[PDB]
Design an enzyme around this catalytic site. Structure first.
Site, short mmCIF file in Angstrom:
data_model
loop_
_atom_site.label_atom_id
_atom_site.label_comp_id
_atom_site.label_asym_id
_atom_site.label_seq_id
_atom_site.Cartn_x
_atom_site.Cartn_y
_atom_site.Cartn_z
CB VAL B 26 -1.04 -0.01 1.16
CG1 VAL B 26 -1.99 1.17 1.04
CG2 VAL B 26 -1.80 -1.34 1.19
CG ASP B 128 -7.62 -10.83 7.81
OD1 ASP B 128 -7.31 -11.39 8.88
OD2 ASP B 128 -6.80 -10.24 7.10
C1 LIG Z 1 -0.13 -1.16 6.08
C2 LIG Z 1 -0.21 0.35 6.05
C3 LIG Z 1 -1.12 0.82 7.17
N1 LIG Z 1 -0.20 0.82 8.33
C4 LIG Z 1 -1.62 2.19 6.86
C5 LIG Z 1 -0.98 3.32 7.38
C6 LIG Z 1 -1.43 4.62 7.08
O1 LIG Z 1 -0.71 5.64 7.69
C7 LIG Z 1 -1.32 6.93 7.59
C8 LIG Z 1 -2.52 4.81 6.21
C9 LIG Z 1 -3.11 3.68 5.69
C10 LIG Z 1 -2.69 2.39 6.00
C11 LIG Z 1 -3.52 1.40 5.28
N2 LIG Z 1 -4.38 2.22 4.42
C12 LIG Z 1 -5.31 1.68 3.52
C13 LIG Z 1 -6.32 2.48 2.97
C14 LIG Z 1 -7.23 1.88 2.10
C15 LIG Z 1 -7.16 0.51 1.85
C16 LIG Z 1 -6.14 -0.20 2.47
C17 LIG Z 1 -5.96 -1.60 2.26
N3 LIG Z 1 -6.60 -2.26 1.32
N4 LIG Z 1 -6.19 -3.57 1.40
C18 LIG Z 1 -5.32 -3.66 2.37
N5 LIG Z 1 -5.13 -2.45 2.95
C19 LIG Z 1 -4.28 -2.20 4.11
C20 LIG Z 1 -5.15 -2.21 5.35
C21 LIG Z 1 -3.25 -3.29 4.26
N6 LIG Z 1 -5.22 0.36 3.28
C22 LIG Z 1 -4.23 3.59 4.74
O2 LIG Z 1 -4.78 4.59 4.31
#
Ligand SMILES: CC[C@@H](N)c1cc(OC)cc2c1CN(c1cccc(-c3nncn3C(C)C)n1)C2=O
Ligand SMILES: CC[C@@H](N)c1cc(OC)cc2c1CN(c1cccc(-c3nncn3C(C)C)n1)C2=O
Lengths: 284, 284
Positions: B26, B128
């Site tokens: 991501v 999950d």
């Molecule tokens: C691993 C990074 C996490 N620590 C993190 C840190 C962060 O810091 C400001 C922002 C974000 C995220 C994750 N994320 C996001 C947003 C949308 C979909 C998804 C998504 N869709 N499929 C799997 N994911 C993620 C959940 C694995 N993730 C953010 O906006």
């Protein structure tokens, strides 16, 4: 793949005589031993994750029972695996009833007894066939019965092993999810149900709902009433009871293979290979 | 079918790698036209799993499920464009702020249950649910994310289902596992209960125990559902919420809509202000 695999061309020891047909995977050939003239069945599988084939070989190799096709070894040559097994001269019960028509109650009783003996042995080794049907029950020239094609059993065992390996962290998993991951959603009693369906297939030339779309059948079974024999007056109350108890909807209430071996239908004293030699003469 | 066959860098500036999910990486990205931030999940690209994941995201229209903006296919990389969540996951937050208060957990549980009630109403299962998959935006809003597990399970079920052949001899319990797996959507209610303990204690129960052993522990007839460690720290309503979400028997486990009327999550003072308070602690 196997530690005892023959890294050689199977044609060094055998003459391929004819192609018989396919199984769950692979093509089976009728072959003749060059030294003794003895006939064998050779299942050729083209080669991939070899995990399923390794499990199939392990299942066959660790079986030493008369009602399970004898295993003679495997050959790996030119990216083709050949599994050498006992040859069954009359083919499967499906090859036979498609020509002769319905089996008699006595002939079905003997086949059910022999299949149950093979199933009781498999289940005693924690093995599940999962593909019991007329096509997987073979008959040799002597009227003897053999269970064959552990392809489905191998695919399920390999899939279960591959699942546990990639299941990841289970700390948020619900107990029912952890249970299906370790032991699947069912047990060996599924084979007892398949045998009851097979007894109906031997009696009526088709399993119940055969003309219904496979996906629709899955949904119907998933108020479902277990199938019954069509012509009540054609069969004894013992055969109807055998169908009733093998087709017990709840697996918890479904009898085991050893328990089924003492059911009146299969414990009759006149059941022997001679009943099948009579059917083979009808085929001629 | 709606995948944009172009480079995502035509519309976005990649700002930072945030981390990985079930699969993929991501990135935080900025829209070149509006300056709006988005999350881009890049996956190196069988495409059955990614197809199901995009379909799950595309057919969700609920505030508690992370918004989907489209996908790009370019140079053998698939980029799924989603709503950016400024505060990250609840795991990113509690690793800095420590344990969440009961009221903050109550609001998160209410929001996740609203998302789950919607998913289950569309015949979808998250599978999950955990702190890492519950994201928080700058407005203190809660979003469920990462349908990777859900997509893998849905693809696997459809792949085995298409390559299972004739089901006419299958026992009802085997047909049921083939169509719906060995469990239902109530597994999400259990995972939410574990997640509530994770928000309260910084780890799910049994975190230090080997993953495979944890699976066995749950399969055993004497398995006791986990509880909160410090009884005196939490209200009897929080203890009861954990008790009913962690009902061992999925049959007795309440649905998401039923859980929405539980005293803990139906309190009138539960709003994003509780998380904004948590985010002000983070700003320090
Ligand atoms: C691993 C990074 C996490 N620590 C993190 C840190 C962060 O810091 C400001 C922002 C974000 C995220 C994750 N994320 C996001 C947003 C949308 C979909 C998804 C998504 N869709 N499929 C799997 N994911 C993620 C959940 C694995 N993730 C953010 O906006
Ligand atoms: C499809 C040909 C069949 N109609 C047929 C016709 C026939 O006519 C003389 C003889 C035979 C067979 C099968 N067979 C045998 C023997 C041993 C193992 C296996 C086996 N191992 N894995 C899958 N199989 C079989 C069940 C597919 N098969 C014979 O001896």
């Amino acid at each position: 793949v196997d530690p005892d695999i023959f890294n050689r061309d199977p044609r060094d020891h055998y003459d391929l005589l004819q192609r018989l047909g396919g199984g769950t995977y692979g093509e089976v050939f009728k072959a003749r031993d060059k030294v003794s003239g003895d006939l064998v069945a050779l299942k050729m599988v083209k080669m991939d994750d070899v995990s399923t084939l390794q499990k199939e070989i392990l299942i066959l190799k660790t079986c030493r029972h008369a009602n399970i096709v004898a295993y003679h070894g495997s050959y790996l040559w030119l990216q083709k695996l050949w599994i050498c097994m006992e040859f069954c001269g009359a083919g499967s019960l499906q090859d036979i009833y498609q020509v002769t028509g319905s089996l008699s109650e006595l002939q079905i009783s003997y086949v059910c007894r022999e299949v149950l003996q093979g199933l009781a042995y498999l289940h005693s080794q924690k093995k599940i066939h999962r593909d019991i049907k007329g096509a997987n029950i073979l008959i040799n020239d002597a009227g003897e019965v053999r269970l064959a094609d552990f392809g489905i059993s191998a695919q399920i065992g390999a899939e279960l092993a591959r699942r546990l390996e990639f299941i990841g962290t289970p700390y948020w998993m619900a107990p029912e999810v952890a249970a299906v991951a370790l032991k699947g959603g069912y047990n060996e009693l599924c084979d007892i149900w398949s045998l009851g369906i097979t007894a109906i297939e031997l009696a009526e030339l088709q399993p119940p709902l055969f003309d219904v779309h496979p996906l629709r059948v899955l949904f119907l079974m998933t108020g479902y009433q277990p199938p019954r024999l069509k012509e009540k007056g054609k069969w004894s109350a013992a055969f109807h009871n055998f169908i009733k108890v093998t087709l017990t909807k709840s697996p918890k209430k479904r009898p085991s293979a050893t328990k089924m071996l003492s059911h009146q239908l299969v414990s009759q004293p006149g059941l022997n290979r001679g009943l099948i030699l009579d059917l083979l003469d009808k085929l001629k």
